Structure formats: structure tokens, C-alpha cells
């Protein structure tokens, strides 16, 4: 009676544990991958991250400058 009205079967806890373990393992793998990607992006500068501004080339004036040699 106690088992029938207060508890469930073993398979429920078993499969809930499986799902929880899958989620946690995926999160750990993602954390490691994110750290490695951050290291590579900061070292190389070839990714979307750690982009530091340079002078906009639209500010340059392309006209004759009263002197032939610029």
C-alpha cells in the first residue's frame, strides 16, 4: 500500500537519472569547448570575438591636394 500510494517504480528514477546525466555531460563538454574557442580567438584575432577597432577608411580624402605627391 505504501509503495502504491506514495512512490513510483525504479524505471522512472533510472531514466530521469539518464536524462540528467546526459544534460550535465553535454554542458561540461560545451564549457571546455568554449574555453578553447575563447583562447584561440584571443590569440589569433580571426574570429568574431576580440575585434578591436581600427581607423575607418571612409574618412580618407581622395582628392588633388595642391601638391602632386599627396
Amino acid at each position: 500500500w505504501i509503495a502504491r500510494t506514495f512512490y513510483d517504480g525504479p524505471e522512472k528514477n533510472y531514466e530521469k537519472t539518464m536524462a540528467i546525466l546526459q544534460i550535465e555531460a553535454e554542458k561540461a563538454e560545451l564549457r571546455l569547448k568554449e574555453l578553447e574557442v575563447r583562447r584561440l580567438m584571443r590569440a589569433r584575432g580571426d574570429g568574431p570575438w576580440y575585434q578591436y577597432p581600427t581607423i575607418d577608411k571612409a574618412l580618407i580624402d581622395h582628392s588633388p591636394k595642391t601638391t602632386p605627391d599627396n
Binding site: 533510472y14 537519472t17 539518464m18 546525466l21 546526459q22 550535465e24 555531460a25 563538454e29
Partner: protein, 175 residues
């Protein structure tokens, strides 16, 4: 009693002597057992029969749960968490079953020692030998794993034991 398997818990045929009175004096033990029977065993038996018939009026069943076999730790990938979870649960169940096997053998040994009397040293050799074998196997499997034991540590211990055995065999063959 049918409540347990006679092969799992063996017993000798229990040969008992016959009463051979030598004198005409009536022994008090027999009379005391007769009055004990009349005053105790009959009412207890009647109450038991009443309770048993009440239980027979309401008969229902429960079952032993069967467990499938799953791949063990020896065929799990390094980081495949689901397979290690299943293998760990299976290994823990096997560990419990082995503990109960050792318990059964120990019960056999204790019953033999009590039953044999003054000749237990000679008449309980088989039980002692069985307990020695089972204890050796259990010690090889599970000793020194620690409180944080796991299937991986048991596999590591077995691998180291097999490496030592292989080295010793190669050394003895190449002697």
C-alpha cells in the same frame, strides 16, 4: 519446510536414537513434554489453523523482479556517460549478489559447526573448504577498493592482477 530450497541449505538425514529405558522409574521429562503438548501445542496449532484458513480465503501473489543484462564497463567508451551509468548499476547489483552468496556460505558453515557437536573439526571440512574458496574469490574481486568504489576501479584492479599473472607465467615458462 518448503519455505526454502533444501539444496541451497543442505542438512544431514538427522538420525536419532530410540528410547531404551533401563529402569522402572518413570522419567519426568516425558510427562512434562506430554503436558506441554496438551497445554501449549494444541491451542497454538488451532490458532494457526484459523489464521491459515483466513489467509486461504484471501490469496494473492508477488513476484521476483528479473533484470536484463546490459553491456559492462569493459565495453564503454571513455566519456559515454549513459553506458557507464548502466554498467555501474549492473556492477553494483552484482556486488550485492556476491555479498549474499558469501552470506549463504557463512550460514552453512555456522550451522555445520553447531550441528556436528564435539566432532566439528573433522565433520565440517567441506563447509570450511567452500568458505575458503568463496572468501578467496570475493577478496580478489572487491578488497581494497575503498569507500568510493566503482566498476572502473574493479576493472583496474583486475587488469593489474592479470598483468602480474602474465608476467609471472612468462617468467616461469622462460625459466
Amino acid at each position: 519446510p518448503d519455505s526454502w530450497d533444501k539444496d541451497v541449505y543442505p542438512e544431514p538425514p538427522r538420525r536419532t536414537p530410540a528410547p531404551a529405558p533401563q529402569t522402572s522409574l518413570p522419567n519426568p521429562v516425558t510427562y512434562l513434554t506430554k503436558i506441554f503438548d496438551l497445554l501449549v501445542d494444541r491451542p497454538v496449532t488451532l490458532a494457526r489453523e484459523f489464521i491459515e484458513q483466513q489467509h486461504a480465503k484471501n490469496r494473492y501473489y508477488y513476484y521476483h523482479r528479473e533484470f536484463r543484462r546490459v553491456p559492462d564497463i569493459t565495453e564503454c567508451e571513455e566519456k559515454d556517460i549513459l553506458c557507464m551509468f548502466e554498467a555501474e548499476m549492473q556492477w553494483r547489483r552484482d556486488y550485492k549478489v556476491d555479498q549474499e552468496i558469501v552470506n549463504i556460505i557463512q550460514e552453512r558453515l555456522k550451522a555445520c559447526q553447531q550441528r556436528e557437536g564435539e566432532s566439528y573439526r573433522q565433520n565440517c571440512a567441506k563447509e570450511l573448504e567452500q568458505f575458503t574458496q568463496v572468501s578467496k574469490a570475493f577478496q580478489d574481486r572487491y578488497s581494497d577498493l575503498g569507500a568510493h568504489y566503482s566498476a572502473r576501479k574493479c576493472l583496474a584492479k583486475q587488469k593489474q592482477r592479470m598483468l602480474a599473472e602474465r608476467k609471472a607465467a612468462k617468467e616461469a615458462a622462460a625459466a
